[PDB]
Amino acid sequence: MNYQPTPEDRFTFGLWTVGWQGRDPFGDATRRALDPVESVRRLAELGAHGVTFHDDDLIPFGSSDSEREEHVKRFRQALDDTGMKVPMATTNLFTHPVFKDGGFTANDRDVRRYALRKTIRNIDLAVELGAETYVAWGGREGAESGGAKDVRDALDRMKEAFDLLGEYVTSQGYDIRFAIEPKPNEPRGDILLPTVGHALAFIERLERPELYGVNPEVGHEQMAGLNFPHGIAQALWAGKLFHIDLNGQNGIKYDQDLRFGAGDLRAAFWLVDLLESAGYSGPRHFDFKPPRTEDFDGVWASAAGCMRNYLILKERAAAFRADPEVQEALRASRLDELARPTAADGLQALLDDRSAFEEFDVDAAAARGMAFERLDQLAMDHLLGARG
Amino acid sequence: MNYQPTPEDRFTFGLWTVGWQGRDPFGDATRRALDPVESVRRLAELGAHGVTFHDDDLIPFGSSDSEREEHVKRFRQALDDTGMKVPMATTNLFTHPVFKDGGFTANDRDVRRYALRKTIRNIDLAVELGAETYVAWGGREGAESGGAKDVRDALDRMKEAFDLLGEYVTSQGYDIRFAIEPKPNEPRGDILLPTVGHALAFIERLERPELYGVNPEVGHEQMAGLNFPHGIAQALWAGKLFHIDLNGQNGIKYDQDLRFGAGDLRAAFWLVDLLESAGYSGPRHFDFKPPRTEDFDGVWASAAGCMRNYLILKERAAAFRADPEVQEALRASRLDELARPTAADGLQALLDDRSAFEEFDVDAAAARGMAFERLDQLAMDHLLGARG
Amino acid sequence: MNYQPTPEDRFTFGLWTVGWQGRDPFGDATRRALDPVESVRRLAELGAHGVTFHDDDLIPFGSSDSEREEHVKRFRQALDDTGMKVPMATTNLFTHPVFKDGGFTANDRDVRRYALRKTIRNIDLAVELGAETYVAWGGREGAESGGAKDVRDALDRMKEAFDLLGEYVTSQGYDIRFAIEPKPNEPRGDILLPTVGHALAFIERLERPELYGVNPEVGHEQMAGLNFPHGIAQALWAGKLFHIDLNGQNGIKYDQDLRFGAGDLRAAFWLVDLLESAGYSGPRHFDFKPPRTEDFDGVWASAAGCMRNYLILKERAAAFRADPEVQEALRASRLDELARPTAADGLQALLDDRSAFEEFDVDAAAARGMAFERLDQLAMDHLLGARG
Amino acid sequence: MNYQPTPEDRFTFGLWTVGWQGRDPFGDATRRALDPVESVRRLAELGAHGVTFHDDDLIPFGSSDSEREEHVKRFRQALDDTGMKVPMATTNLFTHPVFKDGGFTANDRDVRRYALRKTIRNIDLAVELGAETYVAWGGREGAESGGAKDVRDALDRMKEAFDLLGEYVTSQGYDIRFAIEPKPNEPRGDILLPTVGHALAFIERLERPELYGVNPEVGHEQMAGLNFPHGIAQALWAGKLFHIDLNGQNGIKYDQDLRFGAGDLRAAFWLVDLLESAGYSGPRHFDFKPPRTEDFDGVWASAAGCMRNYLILKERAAAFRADPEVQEALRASRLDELARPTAADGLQALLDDRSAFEEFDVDAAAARGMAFERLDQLAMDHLLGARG
Ligand SMILES: O=C[C@H](O)[C@@H](O)[C@H](O)[C@H](O)CO
Ligand SMILES: O=C[C@H](O)[C@@H](O)[C@H](O)[C@H](O)CO
Ligand SMILES: O=C[C@H](O)[C@@H](O)[C@H](O)[C@H](O)CO
Ligand SMILES: O=C[C@H](O)[C@@H](O)[C@H](O)[C@H](O)CO
Ligand code: NI
Ligand code: NI
Ligand code: NI
Ligand code: NI
Ligand code: NI
Ligand code: NI
Ligand code: NI
Ligand code: NI
Ligand code: NI
Ligand code: NI
Ligand code: NI
Ligand code: NI
């Protein structure tokens, strides 16, 4: 058995992932900066499909228009030389001190206007490079204290910002869609739109909701102790899973951004099972950080491992679903009945149906076991490659 | 200073709260059952406005229609004797073994039909008793293992159930609205619609979304480490805060249902500040459990304490907002600017505004402190009654 | 490959595990009670080595001495018929309402004396049945509120209790040792001695510390977000791992007591690697609850799964450690150097060693990568059976 | 009422607290560096008693011996000019890349020797400046992955390091004691000795345990969801609370290091009640970070707020304990009985006492309420200044 990725697998990486220098709240960088061109070349050799970027990853903050041109031309030549694509781009609205209280929901109105202009400039670049999805992660939108932020006013400002961006894209005729990335905390004590559900709910209040979806991240939902596969199922159900960020997280703590497959391994299995069975056709993007213990050889090993673990889990989930014994166990647990309508006969027939209440034998129904443990141990056996 | 509740304060309690007998996963009951009539009389003496119930709290499961009538008539006489109201009712779809895999999203179709009929029977009773809000808490909707529940099918079943209930209420001409109560886990390993955001998002996919809102509970959002006042602000912003359950919780662990004001005290302060400043006019319902250490005197003390703590926090939040020094601090932290539109001049003027980008002095903007710590210490001083 | 347990594998189960009837805080029992004799017979057929019990699991609370004798004689005949052993016993100091504020640290002195007498009666029974370890889980020792419990006085009472029990065992000449089981919360809002570390520290203050060790449980340390294998390593290092409770837990929430291998699968792998490589020779006891969704066939499937998952992980950890490629990776990550003393040359030589400071090349040392990601992906490949 | 600190209150601050420049994992510094001399002068004006430092806070890493002398002389003159003391010092073994896998438990032996020499050099400086306590926070001791660190070998290395430091202090004749600061995670995925209990247990295995205690931090124990006042009570009980770090934390997430009194306010109240009633006489040290939203005026406001909140809580806890109504409630809840020995009559008398078992009326005992809710609402009323 081998597990070699190809560009057809649609694995993508942000420049800032393999390029993370290892600075953390208590420590200096342990690695030198990587030239974006170098990252594109090394990722292509590993079998990746493409790369993503923030404006400031590619073009140093404050660059002159002439240096901006220079940086883009070099990057484009690396893309041309390798066949790598750029399916997604995003804005850095979190590193510079001016964004210390947010971009779109900063209390200072002049900062909010700057945040919008900085974003618009980079959407134009994203379209030129062929990106299909524009992600927004409002990492500084939030608060450490209750009085600092009126959240209803902040949501008004957030909606105003996304509605303006939607007006821009539509007036320019661009074919690009937005994806909001929720995170519950870090770096702010609480971040607005903290989970996939809060982001989905907010989108329905935008003027053109069809332009907006979610970009959920494995470790972010897990920082609130939530079930990531469940949240992804709700996003799919809503038609809003436009992009996804894959990584690993060990529980409720700071966001670790481990390589995919690390952290909660069984959650990773059920996530791959769901993406592949739902036909998700977007990029499989890794937003991870090679630990600062590693040198560059460990960076590339960690990146390769992201893709390897996806492909092992894909094989195991497919084997699980194709196993006749598992298909019989699913019927034993009545997953087939869950897919059937409760009352396609309609309200009135339900009200007239004595077998649904007057003559329903509750004790007999209650005695039926669900057979979930046998089903879950077949899933475990498939994940560990222990079938016999 | 005293803090005496009156029925005008709209404090309400579920029968199951003060009536909790103290059974927990590791222990037997420590208190005898309370007759509902006794609870209504004692709560009225404490100054409560009304009570709420599950079907099975008032009418013992499996009761004959003749005993059902008897139980309702006794309850109604206690309401008439005390002036207590019944603003909300709900269904027990979680205690009986038949609901072990859920009510509306049980894999067994016959159970789902029974769950709907049991619910409909109690909506009719709720309307007769004058309830305005019908809560649904899907405590058994969820899973302990990944294969047991296809969440997209489960969401289809959940939507089908709520759409049928909406058809029923509208065809009967009832003036009642539904409120979905999210909870992330317990008793299932993960529960569907785990937070206020996931519930808000789901409602927008119902056929008649205007009939449905949320009933958030303090401790439930805190079991996912989320900021309850923030989630309530999002519900208010959406127009969907139809009801609220107040209690206390110490962090991420089993749901404790302590009396209101226990658990996270500063969160309780910012919650009351927000409800009172937004003009929330619904019931202030306490869904709490007097600890099983207590006898009945401690039950009534714990219930009184719920109301007392609300009224102390209400006084402190009002004093905070009325203090001229705090009003000046809010302007210093630019909360006034947060309430102003970012770009009422419109997209095109924003794009043409050189002061928003080309000539924006980012360093000067970044140097301005937000003054949030001085503001937060004024809030602390007001909460502790330490102003001078 | 198969994974058949035998009594030589030392797998043991509490009567209360497979016998759990499915009562939870929000629901009635879903299964009938099991006769202890039936459980012993079914577990022996599955390949278990033995069973454990609380006093009240075997002998109904309040039984007459004549009924006590009857229950023990029946149990003993089932042990004789099956070859099953009883390596551990414990006391129920948590279910009866009299223990609502604790057993050994209840505020009421008469309750504390009763708790000690109830415990002593069952140690005598435990020795008669051949138990080697006596577990104490102080599930009701703790508080919901700060004023209810002076923790220094409570620790005095806890120490007094364990010192008396040590005096009893030694004066009777019994060969039995005690194991304290920590848990951070549930059913009390905070429980005393909440983690393995707090229990280890407390033992060192007992009069005869050599008689006391720890009985850590996978899900309990994980309810505080701690690394269970790390805590077990500290207990081994201290010589205090007398017993262990195996199960699974999905993060920080109520204690789920899933079957072993469920919950955090990678933690389960590193736990088995450590127990087997340290030569832990005590029972592998499962303290788990078959989910209340299951009928008795699912109970036995869940129990079998506990043992199966241990044996799969044992095989994978052994293959990992025996792989020459992994042995080379461990040297590359300098695990061999971690095992060597830092300064066996002594203090004075260290102070005189210029290469340790004056002439130490910090930049060269800092540039060396630790190669941990390659090592961790070999571990992942071994766990998933993906080596090539 | 005012709340003015004086040096007699023993409030102390690390140079790195008010000096934090605002760098976080996602953002650049928002404030310029502070000269240590400036911090000492401003803190003295606010009423602080003293300051603490890491070696590298005072003397820039890699400084020449001549620049080292210069930096110390300037600092000493600021201490002389202000009357400020230096009660505690510590080593930075976490910022430089050479410590990326730890100091005392790094896999590379040469790094471990360097870590010890760097520490010893700073103990000599600490004694010269009059420090009484030397803190060790092993922030890089730990792992992101299971194979990277054999924890038994790591604990051997940790013990070897602390034993060498104890030999050094004793051979030099220094009057200084060590305090180990536990933290469960951040910056490593799991840190060794993650809680107060694990640190206390480890100390008992050192060669000279009397030289070592703990320096617990409010937010660190709360990052594992533990009860900080309870952990402090266990440290006091053991005689090991040598120092304490005060700050605030909102639950289980990244360590926020908010000002003291922020985060869990009721926990702060019970902490002050316990320190003051136990007679803790060491420094009240604040290890906090003024949020990066603030300018220098907000830094000093945040620092002042630390001290103010301690003094308000001290007043409220004292009023609580002195209130005759609270003293009566404590007797009603039998706190007086908790302080009495369970069995000072001895084992044999307990075994012969029929009232402790044979004739103990369990039902009567179980019916007695503990009256904890009335007690807790008196505590709440005192905290909020609502007594009447
Ligand atoms: O923790 C933060 C986020 O995961 C971040 O990396 C976003 O993914 C990226 O900035 C948005 O495009
Ligand atoms: O933990 C559970 C819920 O809080 C529950 O009490 C709901 O509030 C009530 O059953 C719905 O009406
Ligand atoms: O959650 C609780 C504990 O795990 C419990 O089952 C103890 O293991 C047993 O009662 C002690 O012997
Ligand atoms: O999060 C980290 C710690 O709290 C740290 O500040 C220690 O207190 C100090 O470095 C030890 O002296
Ligand atoms: Ni992220
Ligand atoms: Ni992340
Ligand atoms: Ni991301
Ligand atoms: Ni609840
Ligand atoms: Ni609750
Ligand atoms: Ni509720
Ligand atoms: Ni347990
Ligand atoms: Ni457990
Ligand atoms: Ni256990
Ligand atoms: Ni800290
Ligand atoms: Ni901290
Ligand atoms: Ni600290």
Provide DSSP, D328-364: HHHHHTTHHHHTS-S-TT-HHHHHH-GGGTTT--HHH
Say if residue C217 carries a ligand binding annotation. yes
Is the Cα torsion angle B288, B294, B300, B301 positive or negative in sign?
negative
User: Can you tell me the distance from the alpha carbon of A148 to that of B333, in angstroms, rounded to the nearest whole number?
Assistant: 7
Chain B residues closer than 8 Å to A167 by CB: 347
Structure tokens at D381: 């009323």
CB of B135 shorter than 6 A to ligand 2: yes
Out of B25, B29, B292, the one facing C24 most closely (by C-beta) is B25
User: Can you tell me the distance from the alpha carbon of A263 to that of A271, in angstroms, rounded to the nearest whole number?
Assistant: 13
Crossing angle of helices C324-332 and C372-383, rounded to 10°: 150
CB of C221 shorter than 6 A to ligand 3: no
Q: Which of B81, B78, B80, B35 has the alpha carbon at shortest distance from B58?
A: B35
Ligand 1 atom with the smallest distance to the CA of A91 is: 12
Q: Would you call A369 and C3 a contact, using CB atoms and an 8 Å cutoff? A: no
Mutate-to-test residue for ligand 3 from C181, C191, C195, highest number of ligand atoms within 8 A of CB: C181
Burial D304-317 (b: 16+ CB within 10 A, else e): bbbbbbbbbbbbbb
Chain A residues closer than 8 Å to B151 by CB: 229-230, 233-234, 237
User: Can you tell me the distance from the alpha carbon of B5 to that of A191, in angstroms, rounded to the nearest whole number?
Assistant: 36
User: Can you tell me the distance from the alpha carbon of B116 to that of A347, in angstroms, rounded to the nearest whole number?
Assistant: 10
Contacts 24+ apart (CB under 8 A), D124-129: D124/D172, D125/D55, D125/D72, D125/D89, D126/D86, D126/D89, D126/D176, D127/D174, D127/D175, D127/D176, D129/D76, D129/D79, D129/D86, D129/D89
Say if residue A175 carries a ligand binding annotation. no
Q: Which of B382, B287, B367 has the alpha carbon at shortest distance from B330?
A: B382
What is the SS3 string spanning chain C?
CCCCCCHHHCEEEEHHHHCCCCCECCECCCCCCCCHHHHHHHHHHHCCCEEEEEHHHHCCCCCCHHHHHHHHHHHHHHHHHHCCECCEEECCCCCCHHHCCCCCCCCCHHHHHHHHHHHHHHHHHHHHCCCCEEEECCCCCEECCHHHCCHHHHHHHHHHHHHHHHHHHHHHCCCCEEEECCCCCCCCCEECCCCHHHHHHHHCCCCCHHHEEECCEHHHHHCCCCCHHHHHHHHHHHCCECCCEECECCCCCCCCCECECECCHHHHHHHHHHHHHHCCCCCEEECCCCCCCCCHHHHHHHHHHHHHHHHHHHHHHHHHHHCHHHHHHHHHCCHHHHCCCCCCCCHHHHHHCHHHCCCCCHHHHHHCCCCHHHHHHHHHHHHCCCCC
Out of C298, C373, C376, the one facing A374 most closely (by C-beta) is C298
Say if residue C110 carries a ligand binding annotation. no
Out of B109, B192, B337, the one facing A337 most closely (by C-beta) is B109
User: Can you tell me the distance from the alpha carbon of B310 to that of B13, in angstroms, rounded to the nearest whole number?
Assistant: 14
CB of D90 shorter than 6 A to ligand 4: yes
Give the residue on D whose Cα is nearest the Cα of A101. D293
Say if residue D35 carries a ligand binding annotation. no
Structure tokens at D95: 């910022």
Compute, in angstroms, the gap from residue A222 CA to the centroid of ligand 1. 15
Catalytically annotated residue among C55, C56, C57, C264: C57
Count CA atoms within 13 Å of residue A148 on its CB side: 27
Looking at all shown ligands, the one closest to residue D26's CA atom is 1
User: Can you tell me the distance from the alpha carbon of D272 to that of C366, in angstroms, rounded to the nearest whole number?
Assistant: 43
Question: What single DSSP character describes residue A35?
Answer: P
Q: Where are the alpha helices (DSSP H) in B129-258?
A: 151-172, 196-203, 218-222, 228-238
Domain ranges of chain B: 1-388
A337 by DSSP, 3-state: which? Answer: helix
Compute, in angstroms, the gap from residue D189 CA to the centroid of ligand 13. 26
Question: What single DSSP character describes residue A327?
Answer: H
CB of D178 shorter than 6 A to ligand 4: no
Chain C residues closer than 8 Å to B101 by CB: 293
Q: Would you call B385 and D380 a contact, using CB atoms and an 8 Å cutoff? A: no
Size of interface C-D (CB pairs under 8 A): 327
Residues D49 and D83: beta-carbon distance below 8 Å = no
Q: What are phi and psi of C216, to 5 degrees?
A: -75, 150
Q: Would you call A26 and D94 a contact, using CB atoms and an 8 Å cutoff? A: yes
Structure tokens at B358: 């080309």
Instruction: Please name the residue whose Cα sits nearest to atom 6 of ligand 2.
Output: B287
Residues A53 and A87: beta-carbon distance below 8 Å = no
Question: What single DSSP character describes residue B85?
Answer: B
Compute, in angstroms, the gap from residue D276 CA to the centroid of ligand 16. 21
The CATH homologous superfamily for domain A1-388 is: Divalent-metal-dependent TIM barrel enzymes (3.20.20.150)
Structure tokens at D201: 């247990």
Chain C residues closer than 8 Å to A308 by CB: 377
Question: What single DSSP character describes residue A51?
Answer: E
Pairing of strands A142-143, A190-191: antiparallel
Total residues found in chain A within this entry: 388
Chain B residues closer than 8 Å to A357 by CB: 113-114, 117-118, 121
Question: What single DSSP character describes residue D286?
Answer: E
Q: What's the CA angle centered on C58, arms C52 and C64, to 5 degrees?
A: 150
Crossing angle of helices A265-278 and A372-383, rounded to 10°: 90
Looking at all shown ligands, the one closest to residue D54's CA atom is 4
Instruction: Please name the residue whose Cα sits nearest to atom 6 of ligand 1.
Output: A287
CB of B140 shorter than 6 A to ligand 2: no
Point out the residues of A that are catalytic: 54, 57
Q: Which of C11, C52, C16 has the alpha carbon at shortest distance from C31?
A: C16
Q: Which of B187, B257, B243, B220 has the alpha carbon at shortest distance from B18?
A: B257
Residues B95 and A366: beta-carbon distance below 8 Å = no
Q: What are phi and psi of A288, to 5 degrees?
A: -135, 165
DSSP lists the bridge partners of residue B284 as: B11
Burial label for A95, CB within 10 Å (0-12, 13-18, 19+), is middle
Q: Which of A104, A114, A129 has the alpha carbon at shortest distance from A15?
A: A129
Total residues found in chain C within this entry: 388
Dihedral, D286, D291, D295, D301 alpha carbons, nearest 10: -40
Residues A211 and A217: beta-carbon distance below 8 Å = no
Strands of the sheet with D284-286, listed across from one edge: D212-214, D177-180, D133-136, D88-90, D50-54, D11-14, D284-286, D245-246
Q: Which of A240, A167, A157 has the alpha carbon at shortest distance from A201?
A: A240
CB of C216 shorter than 6 A to ligand 3: no
Dihedral, B21, B27, B28, B31 alpha carbons, nearest 10: -30
User: Can you tell me the distance from the alpha carbon of A268 to that of A218, in angstroms, rounded to the nearest whole number?
Assistant: 9
Structure tokens at B292: 């099983």
Verify cis geometry, omega within 30 degrees of 0, for the bond prior to A187. yes
Minimal CA separation from A249 to chain C, in Å:
11
Distance of CA C103 to the CA centre of its chain: 21
Question: In sequence order, which residues have a C-beta less than 8 Å from that of residue C42 and are 6 or more positions away?
Answer: C18, C300
Point out the residues of D that are catalytic: 54, 57
Strands of the sheet with C11-14, listed across from one edge: C212-214, C177-180, C133-136, C88-90, C50-54, C11-14, C284-286, C245-246
User: Can you tell me the distance from the alpha carbon of B193 to that of B200, in angstroms, rounded to the nearest whole number?
Assistant: 9
Q: Which of C235, C233, C284 has the alpha carbon at shortest distance from C260?
A: C284
Q: What are phi and psi of B254, to 5 degrees?
A: -50, 155
CB of B183 shorter than 6 A to ligand 2: yes
Q: Would you call D198 and C194 a contact, using CB atoms and an 8 Å cutoff? A: no
